[PDB]
Write a protein that binds this ligand. Structure first.
Ligand SMILES: O=C1NC(=S)S[C@@H]1Cc1ccccc1
Ligand SMILES: [Zn+2]
Length: 258
C-alpha cells in the first residue's frame, strides 16, 4: 500500500484499498459539545504510567512513534468506559502546516494545532495484532495541543527529532515519562471508533481529553521539519498528517463531566 496525506494518496483515496474507510464507526469525528451527554455511569479514569518503559522513537513515514515495552502491565489505562486493562504500546502525534489545523478530532468544529494519541491494547486478547481484530481491542487517549507556552515534558521528544528526520530512521529513546504530556484534568469525551490511518480498523474506544496541553511555537515548528520521505529522496515536509472528521452515524459521544 502507498497511502499518505498528499492530493494523490490522501484520506479521500483510502477507501479504494480500505473499504472500511466508509464504515459505520470511523474516526476521527467532530465532538459537538452541545450534543454530548454527561454519563454518570462512567467509572473514574485511571492512567497508571509510573512504570512506563520507553524504548525507541521511529519515523515511519506517516508520523513518529515513541514505542514502549508492552511485554508486561507497566503502563496501563483502566476505568472510564473501559472494561479490563489496556497496555500502552506507543504514542504519536498528528499536526498541521499552520497552527489553525492539525488535530484529527475537532470540538464544535474547532481544529487544534496537533493531537497526541496514546495507543493501548486490551490485554485479554494477548497481543496487539489480535486486539485490533476486536471491537473493544484498543483504547486511544487523545490529547489536543494548542500553541502557547512551552510544554517542558515534550522537549526531550522535540530534541531527538533531528536524528529521525526521514522515513525509516529510529533512535534509542529510553526513560521518557509520558505523564509529562498530560493536562491537569482528565475530563473526557468517549465514543466507539477506529484507527485513523489504514487499515482503519473499527477496534478503538476513544477517550478524548477536554483540556488541551499548550506547546510553544518553537516546539511545533520542529515537528514540521520532519520528512515524509526517505533519506536521499526529494524533501516532503511531514505536515498535515491528519484525517478529517468522519460521519458520526449511529453513535453517541458521552462526557465524563457535567
Ligand atoms: O495514526 C494513527 N492514529 C491512530 S489512533 S491509529 C494510527 C496508528 C496505527 C496504529 C496501529 C496500527 C496501525 C496504525
Ligand atoms: Zn493517531
Amino acid at each position: 500500500h502507498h497511502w499518505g496525506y498528499g492530493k494523490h494518496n490522501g484520506p479521500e483515496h483510502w477507501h479504494k484499498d480500505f473499504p472500511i474507510a466508509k464504515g459505520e464507526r470511523q474516526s476521527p469525528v467532530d465532538i459537538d459539545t452541545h450534543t454530548a451527554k454527561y454519563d454518570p455511569s462512567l467509572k473514574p479514569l485511571s492512567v497508571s504510567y509510573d512504570q512506563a518503559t520507553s524504548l525507541r522513537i521511529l519515523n515511519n513515514g506517516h508520523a513518529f512513534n515513541v514505542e514502549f515495552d508492552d511485554s508486561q502491565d507497566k503502563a496501563v489505562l483502566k476505568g472510564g468506559p473501559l472494561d479490563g486493562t489496556y497496555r500502552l504500546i506507543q504514542f504519536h502525534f498528528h499536526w498541521g502546516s499552520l497552527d489553525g489545523q492539525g488535530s484529527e478530532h475537532t470540538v464544535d468544529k474547532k481544529k487544534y494545532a496537533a493531537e497526541l494519541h496514546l495507543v493501548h491494547w486490551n490485554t485479554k486478547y494477548g497481543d496487539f495484532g489480535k486486539a485490533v481484530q476486536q471491537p473493544d481491542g484498543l483504547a486511544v487517549l487523545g490529547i489536543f495541543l494548542k500553541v502557547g507556552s512551552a510544554k517542558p515534558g515534550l522537549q526531550k521528544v522535540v530534541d531527538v527529532l533531528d536524528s529521525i528526520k526521514t522515513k525509516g530512521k529510529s533512535a534509542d529513546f529510553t526513560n521518557f515519562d509520558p505523564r509529562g504530556l498530560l493536562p491537569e484534568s482528565l475530563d473526557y469525551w468517549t465514543y466507539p471508533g477506529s484507527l485513523t490511518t489504514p487499515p482503519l480498523l473499527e477496534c478503538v474506544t476513544w477517550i478524548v481529553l477536554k483540556e488541551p496541553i499548550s506547546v510553544s511555537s518553537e516546539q511545533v515548528l520542529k515537528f514540521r521539519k520532519l520528512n515524509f520521505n526517505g533519506e536521499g529522496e526529494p524533501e516532503e515536509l511531514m505536515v498535515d498528517n491528519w484525517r478529517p472528521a468522519q460521519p458520526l452515524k449511529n453513535r453517541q459521544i458521552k462526557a465524563s463531566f457535567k
